[PDB]
RNA sequence: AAAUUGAAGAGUUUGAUCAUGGCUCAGAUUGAACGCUGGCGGCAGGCCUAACACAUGCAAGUCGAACGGUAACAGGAAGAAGCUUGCUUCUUUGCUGACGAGUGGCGGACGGGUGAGUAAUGUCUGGGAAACUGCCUGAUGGAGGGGGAUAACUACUGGAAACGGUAGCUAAUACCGCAUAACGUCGCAAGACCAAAGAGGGGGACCUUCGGGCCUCUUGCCAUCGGAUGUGCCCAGAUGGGAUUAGCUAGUAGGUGGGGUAACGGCUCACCUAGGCGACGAUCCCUAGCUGGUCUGAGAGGAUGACCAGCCACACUGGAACUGAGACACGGUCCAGACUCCUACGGGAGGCAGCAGUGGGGAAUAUUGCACAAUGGGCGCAAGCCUGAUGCAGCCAUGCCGCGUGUAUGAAGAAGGCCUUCGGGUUGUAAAGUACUUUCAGCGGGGAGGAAGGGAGUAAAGUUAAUACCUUUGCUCAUUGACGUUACCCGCAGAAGAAGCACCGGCUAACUCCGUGCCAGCAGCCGCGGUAAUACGGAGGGUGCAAGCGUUAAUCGGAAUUACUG
């Protein structure tokens, strides 16, 4: 089905997870429908490490998309800290 | 085969082939019966054969043998042929 | 990645004092600047137009201590930027950390300044920077680590720096032995014997 | 990952004998009786399992040493299943390296002997190879069904011909057609194997009356050699209280481990008799791996420090690589016998002599050729390894925490040489790679090249060794090659002091011609006069030939020296004097005088007395004394002169100087004259003039 | 505000000149190779050739919360007693923790690989209608009543193996009717017809044949209408070379009707019409995966399709279908062909263009590595398990980038070498010496981040008959890292262990000596070498680069030398 997961771009030992909406049958860094945010686990304490477009994410949930565990934890963290 | 799951699918696909072939043969046998009643020139036996055939193709379209559109086309062409006689 | 040979041969080939030595001694008492290095150095030949463009590029490369690959990258960055290409090239060369350390006066030569910035002795905004090609942005703080503030090299270099002309785009303070980079220097703030148009001409053929 | 078989129940036995003594037959029978094979396959039918290689099924011989294992419990299953890693080694003299490598690592041996001919030329060779490494050995008199089988004669002959202390634990019930079974001397029962089944059923019986007298005579001989072991057992024998069967077997076992007794048995492997009893004696008398600890006299320091390893799992890992085989899929294959410790498939170890890291790709237990992949090997078993890139025979493999270096034995220095060439010759470096890989498998097989001939010289232990090598290269490596005589290097020299020979090269036809004239004297030079036998004298005085062109004639002679006008052999010991010449001012070049000096040199060579020099090599043959003069006669048939003949107590040593062209293939000829128990050595000595027939022979072939 | 600010020529025809005209070079660039040399690090890249053949290991399994069940080990009860009454040993009990084999469900149609074929059942762009769509979702509703088998299992038995053959027994969310039928199908119309499967958690009194019913919760099942996603289909335009390929096509082009597909359609068949395409290049031949892009060029153009991403096609070769929502299916089936392997000779088995790796080919391209810690994927309620995807590590100067191999002082301008018109000049502040520094490497210590979660206890809220069970939300507890001796930081030692390659006649930055004497040889072009060679070889010196330097190959540029710009 259509899911919202993380595509691991970036450099070696320096990841960067593009929060993308895609069908689960495609690859991780492969064909995606829409990029709805990004996540950086090595953010540098002064600037933005996570950004989610919650309107389109909620719109895709209304269409019936599946949120993975890391993306669901990031949505929780965004809705909690802000 | 090589993978354990591959061998299990192989024997299951042969079992379903036997079952689906019997059901497809039975469904096709009823349909030909309606067609023979068309070409022979009878209207009540063709109507009786259609009433024996209609629940057959509906159950085969229901449980997953053929599609509903295929069963729908069979009924539509044969009623269009009972209105010709 | 560095030239490790005799340094006065470079100034003898360029025919100009490239400040490759401290200057505590008069340069004519060290080498014959008016004579080129080698056996046939007394005969001064008629250089071509390609010859004088190449000599200008090697002169500015041997003043700033930059090899050809890094100097080519500096030329591509200067032409990529807006405005004058040669003036942008001079500003990128003077933005280097070893050049700023030498111009601030913590090194008597730019090579010694390179050894000071290579041996973890210069802190940029409170952070140790170990790369001589670190481009210093305007309104920055360049300081000496507390581990090496008691060295004779840095105070001797500051004495030679107060013996020479002070740059106008830098502030120094020998008390705390730190300083401030204020802005990118214009073309009028550096030496006038460098024809930077020859460098741009050379990199166009 | 526990111990499957206790290390005390291991037996690293192996078979070595003379050719066709019955080594492969016994092993085949063992496997069948122990249950590894389900059928009996004969070796002359090509169906024996041990001779897995082609050219072993076809020829009917064994070339390689194949290692298998089996589990034997005894006839009446008197003990738990012992594990025997039996090894069949070839008996031929062309494969002595395959014995020495296998007897580097064997804990026990057994010397099988033909009953009708006991101690044959190679029986003594494998005996000396076995006592080099002090291997405890048993004896199995095979072929007791053969016509003229004599068991008590061969037990006399092993003692007499080889100097040993054999005491039989068996006595043959019958001869060629009477060999129903054998009577055991430690039990006083008769074992008669049933003919119906392939000898699987063995019936116990009493002894017949003639055999009663003879077996009673030999049984007391067994007790004395048992009582020799300790003074407690000596006082036991003179004390008159018979002896328990456990103490004879214990005492006899004690004497076997110290190389004191031989414990001869008998049997007939082709008639499926007396094989089960041999296996029992291997259980009862051959050592376990736990017996003698491996003294590794090097601790990898460079300061040579004696250490050792006992045989247990809890010790550091130490193993010895004793056989490298080639493989078309995995590269090479490395046999090893673990002395101590446990290693896993995937663990890294230390090639201690090459001082390199070595990981184990996988570890396979070996049958004759097929492999069973296993997880890890304990201390005291033999297995092969895939994925060792640079391991030679005799290298030790140990854990890098305890780097030790074992003895690193020496190789027998091959004795015969041929020159090999490809059929189509496009397969030149394929043959080079193939013989390089085959040289890494066999350390007694040498390959090199000689750029004097630009040839490839294969060397081995016999002509059969080289025939197997070239046939294995054709099948396995697909390089079909033809062999032949290695080209002997000759030299040529002149005599008669030819003088005033003038050669002039003039080519002026208009437009920069070349002109040179030279008159020179060619004189034979004594060898000690110059480091190189070439002296050029500038007798030219006051012009005539300009100084600049004086070296040009010298260089021209030097190229002429490299290839002789007669044939192509290099000229040696030549003195040249340039007394007179002529020079044109505008047409005289370096090359003009080179052509001029070459015309003159050729003209002088024919006028002078030009002869070939063959090389003569110093030859030292060592032979038995009974067939001394035949060796000398063959030496006189090989056009060789003689400088002496020493007669040691071990054998006669004859010295000679034989020409190299008549030293081609001497080893097979020397073995034919001497029952194959002679050896020799060649060293190049000098050059000497050839007779007229052989000089006339080498000129016709080279010229055309 | 900023998003392109961009364009060099030289040599060579002649006695000399101008013009034309080819040839050659200076520049970028690469999945490169070779020669010499070689310190470290980061990032990236790495069979371009034989879609040549492949040993071995691994690459797709999961679910006991679907079912009959115990074969293995871990408990609980009868249980003789190992017995030392606690020392827990020997026999039954599927009694439960679980779980081999088996039925069943889902996934194996994804991920991964390759570019053989395909000049169009392809791709790209823009459109369209005649359709299907598992898992994921929204809404409306049902989930009643039965039956016949059969695997496993039991007994016999053929087989060397692969595998079976008989005769009986049994279960289900396996299978098959019947009941029900509409906003579904067919029929304008009355009418006719069509489905299902249960399983777990807990419980208060009831109630009971003692198994349970019963109530509540979770999950699954069926039907219809949708949504989303995926896919099928159609049209237009664009997408190589060849005219020394000019005519091609009879299911061909169209109509009628039947059949067929999920769907329109010559998709198929019967009949009828005789059309259809084509110099706007049909047909035929050769070549070729296409694109986003990449390289070059000032631009227009030219060249290209490595890595990454999208689509397509292929899975030993040829053909075919089955199962399935989805395949005509890389690690499924069937047949034929070639090849390989096994065999007891009677028979069997297999497809690395998955990851490693081997042989072969070649100028040349790497490890038979670690871990599921993270990101995903499959299955499962979940724990969890599987994952050669992936994350990493190993090898290679293959590329890019960064850094180092010291810094300051130092004239007797030391010695030696080279040149010398013998005065000297040069190597050359170079060296030595004096002082200072310790980056990188070496040694030792400290030490992030990639970790989100998940599991146990809790408290609250929802739930209901219940203060159980379940869901959600906060707290506490002990934990999850292959990389990894991680990045990073500190400290000890001493300049300490760290520079080569090409070139020097013009193009083109750099000149002399010696040797050679149209010889050896050099060379990209002009050309050089016959005795004073700045062109050959050595030396000194210098120049240009630098852990790289040159050569070769290849594309573009210069070439306005196919000129649309021009
Ligand atoms: N009559 C008889 N013939 C035997 C016996 N044992 C072996 N043979 C025959 O001798 C030949 C066997 O000798 P092998 O043992 O195979 O040769 P080998 O001793 O193994 O050693 P290599 O030749 O070096 O490989 C065959 O022909 C056997 O049939 C025996 O006991 N009795
Ligand atoms: Mg660099
Ligand atoms: Mg014989
Ligand atoms: Mg023979
Ligand atoms: Mg043999
Ligand atoms: Mg390829
Ligand atoms: Mg399905
Ligand atoms: Mg119904
Ligand atoms: Mg192609
Ligand atoms: Mg252009
Ligand atoms: Mg598949
Ligand atoms: Mg495969
Ligand atoms: Mg592979
Ligand atoms: Mg697995
Ligand atoms: Mg001097
Ligand atoms: Mg360090
Ligand atoms: Mg962490
Ligand atoms: Mg052009």
């Amino acid at each position: 089905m259509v899911t919202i997961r993380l595509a691991r771009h970036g450099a070696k030992k320096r990841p960067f997870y593009q929060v993308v909406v895609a069908d689960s049958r495609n690859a991780r860094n492969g064909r995606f429908i829409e990029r709805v945010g990004f996540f950086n686990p090595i953010a540098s304490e002064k600037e933005e490490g996570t950004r989610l477009d919650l309107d389109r994410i909620a719109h895709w949930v209304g269409q019936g998309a599946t949120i993975s565990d890391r993306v669901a934890a990031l949505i929780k963290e965004v809705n909690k800290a802000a | 085969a090589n993978i354990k799951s591959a061998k299990k699918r192989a024997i299951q696909s042969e079992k379903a082939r036997k079952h689906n072939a019997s059901r497809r043969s039975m469904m096709r046998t009823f349909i030909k019966k309606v067609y023979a009643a068309i070409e022979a020139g009878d209207k009540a036996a063709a109507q009786k054969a259609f009433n024996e055939m209609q629940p057959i193709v509906d159950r085969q379209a229901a449980k997953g043998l053929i599609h509903k559109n295929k069963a729908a086309r069979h009924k539509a062409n044969l009623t269009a042929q009972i209105n010709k006689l | 990645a560095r030239y490790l040979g005799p340094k006065l041969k470079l100034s003898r080939r360029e025919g100009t004092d490239l400040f490759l030595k401290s200057g505590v001694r008069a340069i004519d008492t060290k080498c014959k600047i008016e004579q080129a290095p080698g056996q046939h150095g007394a005969r001064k030949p008629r250089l071509s137009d390609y010859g004088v463009q190449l000599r200008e590029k090697q002169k500015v490369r041997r003043i700033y201590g930059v090899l050809e690959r890094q100097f080519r990258n500096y030329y591509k960055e200067a032409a990529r930027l807006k405005g004058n290409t040669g003036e942008n090239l001079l500003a990128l060369l003077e933005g280097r950390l070893d050049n700023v350390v030498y111009r601030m006066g913590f090194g008597a030569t730019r090579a010694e300044a390179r050894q000071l910035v290579s041996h973890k002795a210069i802190m940029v905004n409170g952070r140790v920077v170990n790369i001589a090609s670190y481009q210093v942005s305007p309104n920055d703080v360049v300081s000496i680590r507390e581990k090496a503030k008691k060295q004779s090299r840095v105070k001797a270099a500051l004495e030679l720096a107060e013996q020479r002309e002070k740059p106008t785009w830098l502030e120094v303070d020998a008390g705390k032995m730190e300083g401030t980079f204020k802005r990118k220097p214009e073309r009028s703030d550096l030496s006038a014997d460098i024809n930077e148009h020859l460098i741009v001409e050379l990199y166009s053929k | 990952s526990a111990r499957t078989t206790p290390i005390a129940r291991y037996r690293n036995i192996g078979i070595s004998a003379h050719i066709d003594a019955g080594k492969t037959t016994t092993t085949e029978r063992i496997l069948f009786y122990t249950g590894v094979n389900h059928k009996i396959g004969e070796v002359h039918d090509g169906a024996a399992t041990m001779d897995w290689m082609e050219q072993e099924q076809e020829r009917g011989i064994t070339i390689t040493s194949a290692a298998t294992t089996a589990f034997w419990s005894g006839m009446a299953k008197q003990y738990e299943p012992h594990r025997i890693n039996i090894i069949d080694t070839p008996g031929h003299v062309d494969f002595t390296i395959e014995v020495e490598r296998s007897m580097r690592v064997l804990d026990g041996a057994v010397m099988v002997y033909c009953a009708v001919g006991g101690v044959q030329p190679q029986s003594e060779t494998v005996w000396r190879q076995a006592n080099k490494y002090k291997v405890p050995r048993i004896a199995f008199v095979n072929k007791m069904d053969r016509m003229g089988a004599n068991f008590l004669k061969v037990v006399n002959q092993i003692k007499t011909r080889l100097g040993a202390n054999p005491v039989p634990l068996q006595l043959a019930i019958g001869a060629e057609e009477h060999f129903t079974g054998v009577v055991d001397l430690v039990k006083m029962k008769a074992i008669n194997w049933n003919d119906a089944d392939q000898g699987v059923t063995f019936e116990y019986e009493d002894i017949p009356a003639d055999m009663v007298e003879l077996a009673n005579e030999w049984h007391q001989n067994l007790i004395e050699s048992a009582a020799e072991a300790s003074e407690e057992l000596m006082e036991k024998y003179l004390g008159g209280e018979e002896l328990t069967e456990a103490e004879i077997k214990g005492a006899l076992r004690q004497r076997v481990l110290n190389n004191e007794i031989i414990l001869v048995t008998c049997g007939s492997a082709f008639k499926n008799k007396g094989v089960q009893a041999m296996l029992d004696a291997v259980i009862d008398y051959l050592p376990s791996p736990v017996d003698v600890p491996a003294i590794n006299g090097i601790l990898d320091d460079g300061k040579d420090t004696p250490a050792e390893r006992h045989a247990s799992d809890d010790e550091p890992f130490s193993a010895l690589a004793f056989k490298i085989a080639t493989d078309p899929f995995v590269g090479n294959l490395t046999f090893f016998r673990v002395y101590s410790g446990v290693v896993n498939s995937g663990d890294t170890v230390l090639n201690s002599v090459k001082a390199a890291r070595e990981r184990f790709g996988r570890i396979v237990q070996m049958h004759a050729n097929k492999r069973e992949e296993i997880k890890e090997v304990r201390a005291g078993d033999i297995a092969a390894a895939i994925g060792l890139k640079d391991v030679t025979t005799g290298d030790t493999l140990c854990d890098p925490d305890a780097p030790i270096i074992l003895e690193r034995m020496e190789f027998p220095e091959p004795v015969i040489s041929i020159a090999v060439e490809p059929k189509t010759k496009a397969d030149q470096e394929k043959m080079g790679l193939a013989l390089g890989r085959l040289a890494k498998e066999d350390p007694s097989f040498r390959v090199w090249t000689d750029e004097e001939s630009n040839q490839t010289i294969i060397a081995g232990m016999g002509e059969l060794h080289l025939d197997i090598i070239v046939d294995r290269m054709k099948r396995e490596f697909n390089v079909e090659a033809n062999v032949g005589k290695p080209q002997v290097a000759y030299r040529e020299t002149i005599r008669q002091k030819v003088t005033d020979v003038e050669g002039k090269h003039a080519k002026q036809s208009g437009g920069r011609g070349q002109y040179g004239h030279v008159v020179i004297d060619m004189y034979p030079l004594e060898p000690g006069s110059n480091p190189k036998g070439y002296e050029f004298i500038n007798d030219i005085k006051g012009g005539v030939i300009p100084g600049e062109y004086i070296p040009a004639v010298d260089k021209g002679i030097q190229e002429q020296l490299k290839a002789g006008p007669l044939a192509g052999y290099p000229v040696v010991d030549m003195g040249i004097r340039l007394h007179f010449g002529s020079y044109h001012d505008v047409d005289s070049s370096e090359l003009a005088f080179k052509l001029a000096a070459s015309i003159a040199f050729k003209e002088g060579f024919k006028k002078a007395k030009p002869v070939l020099l063959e090389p003569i090599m110093k030859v030292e043959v060592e032979t038995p004394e009974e067939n001394t003069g035949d060796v000398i006669g063959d030496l006189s048939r090989r056009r060789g002169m003689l400088k002496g003949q020493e007669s040691e107590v071990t054998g006669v040593k004859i010295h000679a100087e034989v020409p190299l062209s008549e030293m081609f293939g001497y080893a097979t000829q020397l073995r034919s004259l001497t029952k194959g128990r002679a050896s020799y050595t060649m060293e190049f000595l000098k050059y000497d003039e050839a007779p007229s027939n052989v000089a006339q022979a080498v000129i016709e072939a080279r010229g055309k």
Side-chain angles (χ1 to χ4, degrees), chain D residues 49-69:
Chain D
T49 174
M50 288 300 124
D51 290 332
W52 52 269
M53 202 196 335
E54 50 207 33
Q55 310 107 202
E56 254 181 18
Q57 295 156 329
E58 313 171 340
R59 304 288 300 278
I61 62 185
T62 315
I63 304 167
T64 184
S65 66
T68 64
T69 166

Side-chain angles (χ1 to χ4, degrees), chain D residues 316-407 409-420 422-440 442-576:
Chain D
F317 172 69
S318 73
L320 183 47
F322 68 98
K323 188 164 166 42
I324 309 298
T326 183
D327 196 284
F329 302 106
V330 311
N332 75 86
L333 182 74
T334 301
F335 288 79
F336 59 93
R337 140 109 163 82
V338 173
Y339 276 131
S340 50
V342 181
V343 82
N344 284 84
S345 85
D347 276 15
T348 46
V349 284
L350 180 62
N351 194 353
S352 335
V353 277
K354 285 184 192 50
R357 272 275 195 309
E358 257 317 350
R359 196 185 140 260
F360 278 160
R362 65 190 176 114
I363 295 180
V364 315
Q365 201 249 24
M366 285 289 298
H367 207 182
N369 209 33
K370 65 286 289 183
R371 315 159 186 87
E372 180 97 27
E373 23 226 344
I374 47 175
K375 55 205 67 50
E376 47 217 290
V377 283
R378 303 271 171 232
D381 45 37
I382 297 103
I386 301 74
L388 305 176
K389 51 175 67 67
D390 24 59
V391 180
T392 38
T393 298
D395 299 349
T396 174
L397 298 143
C398 50
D399 57 311
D401 293 348
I404 63 160
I405 293 177
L406 288 294
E407 308 160 23
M409 45 78 181
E410 182 60 30
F411 310 125
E413 190 55 28
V415 311
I416 172 182
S417 316
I418 51 174
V420 62
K423 274 180 171 33
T424 76
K425 191 178 118 263
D427 322 324
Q428 254 284 332
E429 292 295 324
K430 312 189 82 175
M431 186 205 302
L433 269 306
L435 298 143
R437 263 153 54 51
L438 260 170
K440 310 185 48 66
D442 282 79
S444 79
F445 166 67
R446 226 58 63 81
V447 53
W448 65 94
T449 181
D450 262 285
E451 69 297 297
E452 28 168 39
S453 311
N454 215 315
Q455 260 182 340
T456 299
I457 330 278
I458 261 48
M461 296 321 288
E463 72 151 6
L464 176 64
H465 195 222
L466 303 185
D467 259 301
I468 288 326
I469 278 295
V470 67
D471 205 314
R472 287 185 51 200
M473 190 174 47
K474 187 257 285 182
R475 311 222 201 208
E476 309 189 349
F477 297 90
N478 320 322
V479 191
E480 206 158 339
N482 42 20
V483 310
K485 177 73 175 26
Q487 289 316 105
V488 25
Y490 285 73
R491 304 296 138 161
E492 63 201 59
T493 199
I494 69 150
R495 282 166 196 64
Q496 114 164 20
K497 204 300 183 172
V498 137
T499 179
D500 311 350
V501 47
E502 32 207 350
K504 180 184 68 182
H505 145 75
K507 272 284 70 182
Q508 319 90 321
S509 49
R512 192 52 180 298
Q514 31 178 16
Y515 171 87
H517 174 58
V518 82
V519 194
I520 49 96
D521 313 309
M522 294 165 60
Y523 40 94
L525 212 54
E526 75 99 349
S529 54
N530 272 166
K532 78 296 302 183
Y534 173 56
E535 86 174 23
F536 157 86
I537 304 305
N538 181 3
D539 258 16
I540 270 301
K541 271 174 270 56
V544 182
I545 288 195
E548 42 198 26
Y549 305 126
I550 289 286
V553 311
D554 178 328
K555 299 317 156 295
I557 306 306
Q558 287 178 183
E559 67 77 7
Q560 284 301 320
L561 286 214
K562 296 169 188 175
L566 176 168
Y569 286 121
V571 194
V572 71
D573 79 71
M574 163 147 313
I576 302 273

Side-chain angles (χ1 to χ4, degrees), chain D residues 476-593 595-704:
Chain D
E476 309 189 349
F477 297 90
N478 320 322
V479 191
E480 206 158 339
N482 42 20
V483 310
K485 177 73 175 26
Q487 289 316 105
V488 25
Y490 285 73
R491 304 296 138 161
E492 63 201 59
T493 199
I494 69 150
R495 282 166 196 64
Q496 114 164 20
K497 204 300 183 172
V498 137
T499 179
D500 311 350
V501 47
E502 32 207 350
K504 180 184 68 182
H505 145 75
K507 272 284 70 182
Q508 319 90 321
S509 49
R512 192 52 180 298
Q514 31 178 16
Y515 171 87
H517 174 58
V518 82
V519 194
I520 49 96
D521 313 309
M522 294 165 60
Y523 40 94
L525 212 54
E526 75 99 349
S529 54
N530 272 166
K532 78 296 302 183
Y534 173 56
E535 86 174 23
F536 157 86
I537 304 305
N538 181 3
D539 258 16
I540 270 301
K541 271 174 270 56
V544 182
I545 288 195
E548 42 198 26
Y549 305 126
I550 289 286
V553 311
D554 178 328
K555 299 317 156 295
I557 306 306
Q558 287 178 183
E559 67 77 7
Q560 284 301 320
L561 286 214
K562 296 169 188 175
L566 176 168
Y569 286 121
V571 194
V572 71
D573 79 71
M574 163 147 313
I576 302 273
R577 162 189 154 198
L578 170 42
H579 68 107
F580 180 74
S582 167
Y583 101 88
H584 185 266
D585 182 18
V586 153
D587 278 327
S588 285
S589 48
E590 175 176 30
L591 185 58
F593 283 99
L595 268 66
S598 178
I599 293 176
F601 178 102
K602 295 282 197 187
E603 289 167 331
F605 214 83
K606 62 88 176 179
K607 296 164 188 301
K609 302 291 76 178
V611 316
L612 272 299
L613 299 307
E614 64 172 356
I616 320 290
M617 341 255 310
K618 160 188 301 176
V619 181
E620 305 164 26
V621 312
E622 184 171 70
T623 183
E625 64 279 314
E626 335 103 15
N627 42 78
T628 297
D630 324 285
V631 168
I632 297 122
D634 197 0
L635 288 167
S636 325
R637 275 311 317 221
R638 282 166 180 274
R639 312 176 15 237
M641 189 254 288
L642 274 202
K643 327 281 211 154
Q645 47 185 168
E646 236 177 65
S647 286
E648 284 158 295
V649 300
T650 180
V652 186
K653 273 192 61 67
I654 293 99
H655 314 277
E657 317 186 349
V658 193
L660 174 63
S661 50
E662 270 299 276
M663 262 316 328
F664 172 67
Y666 185 70
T668 175
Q669 206 28 75
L670 183 62
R671 279 161 178 161
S672 292
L673 305 161
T674 327
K675 314 283 194 66
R677 60 183 47 146
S679 33
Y680 84 110
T681 307
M682 279 198 339
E683 297 185 344
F684 164 67
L685 182 62
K686 65 184 181 178
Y687 269 91
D688 197 5
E689 192 190 299
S692 297
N693 49 282
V694 291
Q696 200 210 45
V698 303
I699 291 182
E700 283 110 29
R702 270 278 262 297
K704 312 304 162 274

